[PDB]
Design a protein around this ligand. Structure first.
Ligand SMILES: NC(=O)C1=CN([C@@H]2O[C@H](COP(=O)(O)OP(=O)(O)OC[C@H]3O[C@@H](n4cnc5c(N)ncnc54)[C@H](O)[C@@H]3O)[C@@H](O)[C@H]2O)C=CC1
Ligand SMILES: NC(=O)C1=CN([C@@H]2O[C@H](COP(=O)(O)OP(=O)(O)OC[C@H]3O[C@@H](n4cnc5c(N)ncnc54)[C@H](O)[C@@H]3O)[C@@H](O)[C@H]2O)C=CC1
Ligand SMILES: NC(=O)C1=CN([C@@H]2O[C@H](COP(=O)(O)OP(=O)(O)OC[C@H]3O[C@@H](n4cnc5c(N)ncnc54)[C@H](O)[C@@H]3O)[C@@H](O)[C@H]2O)C=CC1
Ligand SMILES: NC(=O)C1=CN([C@@H]2O[C@H](COP(=O)(O)OP(=O)(O)OC[C@H]3O[C@@H](n4cnc5c(N)ncnc54)[C@H](O)[C@@H]3O)[C@@H](O)[C@H]2O)C=CC1
Ligand SMILES: O=C(O)[C@@H]1CCCCN1
Ligand SMILES: O=C(O)[C@@H]1CCCCN1
Ligand SMILES: O=C(O)[C@@H]1CCCCN1
Ligand SMILES: O=C(O)[C@@H]1CCCCN1
Lengths: 277, 277, 279, 278
């Protein structure tokens, strides 16, 4: 309750998490501060109306915060760590949200200034903004047991959250981190299919999104295999099995596997370049 | 509250709706009766444990019911209507859930026995079982205004529900009716992609489903275009835009359009055969 | 009982051989209580039937007079000529079992009813694995088949594999799945063997391992209540070799090709029978 | 062999499958079997419990209980396991590695640091051992005695086909019969969807497709004829089956199965190459 939260970066992810946290009630907007070198951002304007404290100065965010989220682009992380490293205290829990960036790389930058930085790495996604996020976290070398439990409590307020080994996170990034983009592409296309068959666009968007929401919820609430739930939809000779055939004829399943793989491979490739630098 | 509901048919759709209605609290299990010529069905066993009254005799379902759902396969509908047509009373609201079957065809069969049958046609989907269904309905020639409002009240308890013109329903069937099957295929494949990149299968299923649920919820709660929400996920040069490219290279969008179209075309084709018979 | 039943095959080809070998291997019938007829004795199937001890004759009337249960095992377009030829020889005691793809009970009963009013007709679809008593058989009973006729036919065909009664309107689809099925399987086993050879296995070992793998997986599914996707999930470890191989199957639309096959077989069956009904 | 104690290090899919097959075969009483795992909250551990298999978290307990010791852990866990119990391997032990890709030489090098001449056998099997129709190959290590191989072949023949091979074939066998059940399950799911599309109930389509594949596989195993000849026997000229074969050929059906065996084998070799660099 006395917990103060800070965001280095004031972009899409910082907005989504601050919106989710405040809607969840687990944090008052006034306990949150975010910093950015650009206050002319739509997300900065939104955070202001929410009641989040804003500043150009990353040092002010550090000084206000107990839990410090790093919500900048991955290549900005080392610059950020050099800038505020001398201002980290024993009270701080540093939570990196950046795609690809390793706990090792973060702990090495911070340890030059003060031993035993408490670091947690997470991967989440934009649906935390409607409290339906998918989040994983890995705890660092000096994180205490209460640090992981605190972070799971906080991130569970805005969706699914579980601890993982760090070597799983790049793959999670390709699945649930990039996942919403696959869904939005799919929903746009399903709506176009509805329009082609005679539905108004607004209705098609609503129906397609509601269908995907409900099916996903069924699977999360069921112990059955997704193929069994699929079997339950189709009648023999019917419309649904005819539609499933044309998906299969296009290699639909393989394209989704291709996407998760391509995201994960790019994440690893980018971090290799960072480590080489 | 005094309303009694009956299901002709005791299969996947009847279970899903009865489960959703009772979980919603809008109906007590004991106000529901369902009939089937086969009590050795898993769905019949499930309905029994819920507290739903079961019978082999469709006439008993009619006699108990105020609202009567037709939840049999489309080709069974005319047989069903011939069987119980003499038992429909002025109190009855007949709600056909059957894919493709027209209000005209139903009103013609029932009108031979008694004038002015009150008929509503709906299309829904299995996620009503977790109260996240997508339902549309069209009112028949003799349905009263309170009949449509009653049905929207009832079906809104288990998900989205809106009135449509009947000529939209076959297209809705290809989008949200068959939709859950597209989602389950997609979730199975996304999980395989997670497994390929090193995630345990149970975790990949959970993450993929949670990602699709959250993205769908974002779109339902946003006024923004799905392409804008997609743009918000990707950073320049990043993992997500790399993954979106490989989806595009496979014609991912076109496959989903193909599916909605194929389902809708099959539905129309099947009903043409029924009308020819 | 069963060994006292006389069985006849009109047609002495691949299906008659497969069934006669299955029945005799099962011990339900003595080979010499089977008679088969063909206008062509220079077939390999006739020679094999002869070596088993089946009675062979060129005269379909002899097969009819010999038999109690009479299997029609000729090509579908031959059935109406067969029915014209021996229809007058069908007796009240006969059970007539059509194995021909596509041919309807109605077409058979219309021919035979011109001779006697209540011909007992059963239609079945089976497959060549009856030869190792692992066939997949369905049957539908005709207008005049007694309840005991269906029970007898199920007992007989269960001796050489799986057997269940179905409505007749399912049989063309069954034909595209389990009737044509063994050919899809032999194609797949030939290709899996080539895959083993490409990766360095001797052909003989690759053939045996591929066939054992498919047999064991199919038996697993038949003995499990789990979805095939779940059994599939259990084979793969994260990042491992099996999931990499499943991806390249998916990239080629592997699933859609098998759906295409069942559909193509069933559509061709319906199309041929429509030409027969037109003729 | 009633004087034989079998142990599993690992209590996952493969250990369950083998234990269920051995016990169903009657060659082992379930109480003569011990399995270890650091995680007792697995579905496979509960199933092993109900069978009457002894469970323990301690790999050393499994080693002390067992004469034949199956390594049923993921390949990257093998070197850790060997470090943990290498000092407990006795002369009596036969160590049977089931792990994909892991070489006899790598196992022998680990165990030899503790006691010379470890008796090592490498095998590749598959999950259908659970219905006693597995396909297993094995290779004997440097110090395996002649009777060690014969004993293993007797034990593994009780749950399916089993033959000795040169070790350099095992990665390819892994891509064919090791991964093979997954190809079949994919095919059976798809064939069932095909049956449903043409009007069959799903339960019936699943049963018929599985029976068709089982019977055709048995036909081939029992026949001296080429699979092409058995295929030819199914088709009549102009008929339904040859029409269906054509659409398989037009999609390169054969090439996809070759692709799968190749992709599995290449990945196995790639993974072990990384293990050997580490
Ligand atoms: N957008 C998404 O869907 C998700 C993004 N992420 C991660 O979140 C991090 C940020 O992602 P987005 O918010 O999408 O980026 P974004 O580009 O919307 O916001 C980036 C923010 O960093 C600020 N910034 C740049 N230099 C700075 C500095 N020196 N000090 C402080 N702030 C600075 C920018 O002004 C902007 O406010 C990335 O590492 C990304 O991998 C992870 C999960 C999902
Ligand atoms: N499964 C789905 O996803 C949805 C299905 N529907 C529609 O719901 C209707 C039923 O669909 P499912 O429940 O999936 O079918 P289902 O096959 O699971 O259940 C069909 C039920 O009808 C019963 N039945 C057969 N003959 C009968 C008779 N003479 N009298 C009474 N009951 C009889 C069967 O025994 C079975 O209980 C279909 O028209 C379908 O289009 C619509 C929305 C979604
Ligand atoms: N081969 C298979 O895998 C299966 C075939 N079937 C059905 O079995 C029937 C026969 O198929 P196959 O045995 O494969 O054909 P096949 O061509 O091997 O043998 C056909 C037999 O009919 C004989 N025949 C031709 N004219 C005749 C006549 N007037 N009187 C008597 N016999 C005559 C031929 O000489 C030959 O012995 C077909 O209707 C086919 O659909 C059904 C299930 C599987
Ligand atoms: N599943 C299959 O279809 C086949 C698997 N294999 C091989 O069998 C081995 C196991 O495969 P699955 O059983 O499928 O894996 P699985 O993941 O189902 O079970 C793995 C087991 O290892 C246990 N484990 C992890 N660390 C351990 C440790 N330090 N000490 C003891 N147990 C530990 C886990 O708790 C789990 O019980 C792999 O090397 C695989 O290549 C070979 C043939 C077929
Ligand atoms: O495949 C079918 O016959 C049905 C039609 C309606 C929505 C669900 N699936
Ligand atoms: O495209 C990107 O850079 C990020 C990576 C992490 C998840 C969201 N998208
Ligand atoms: O996918 C895997 O890791 C294993 C390899 C061995 C055979 C079965 N599947
Ligand atoms: O190709 C054919 O004509 C037959 C039809 C029946 C099943 C087996 N093959």
């Amino acid at each position: 309750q006395s917990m103060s939260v800070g965001f280095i970066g004031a972009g899409q992810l910082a907005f989504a998490l601050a919106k989710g946290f405040t809607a969840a009630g687990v944090l008052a907007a006034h306990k949150i501060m975010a910093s950015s070198p650009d206050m002319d951002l739509a997300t900065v304007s939104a955070l202001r109306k929410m009641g989040v404290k804003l500043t150009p100065h990353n040092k002010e965010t550090v000084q206000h915060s107990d839990v410090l989220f790093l919500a900048v682009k991955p290549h900005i992380i080392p610059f950020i760590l050099d800038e505020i490293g001398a201002d980290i205290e024993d009270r701080h829990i540093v939570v990196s949200c950046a795609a690809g960036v390793t706990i090792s790389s973060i702990e090495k930058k911070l340890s030059a200034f003060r031993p035993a930085p408490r670091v947690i790495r997470c991967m989440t996604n934009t649906p935390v903004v409607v409290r339906e996020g998918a989040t994983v976290y890995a705890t660092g070398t000096h994180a205490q047991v209460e640090d992981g439990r605190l972070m799971e409590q906080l991130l569970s307020s805005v969706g699914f959250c579980t601890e993982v080994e760090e070597d799983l996170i790049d793959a999670v990034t390709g699945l649930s981190g990039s996942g919403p983009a696959y869904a939005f592409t799919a929903l746009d296309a399903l709506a176009d299919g509805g329009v082609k068959m005679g539905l108004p666009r607004r209705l098609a968007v609503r129906l397609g999104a509601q269908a995907l929401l409900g099916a996903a919820k069924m699977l999360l609430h069921s112990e059955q295999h997704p193929g069994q739930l699929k079997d339950n939809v189709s009648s023999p000779g019917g419309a649904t099995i005819h539609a499933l055939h044309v998906l299969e004829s296009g290699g639909f399943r393989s394209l989704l596997i291709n996407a998760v793989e391509a995201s994960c491979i790019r994440t690893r490739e980018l971090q290799s370049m960072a480590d080489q630098e």
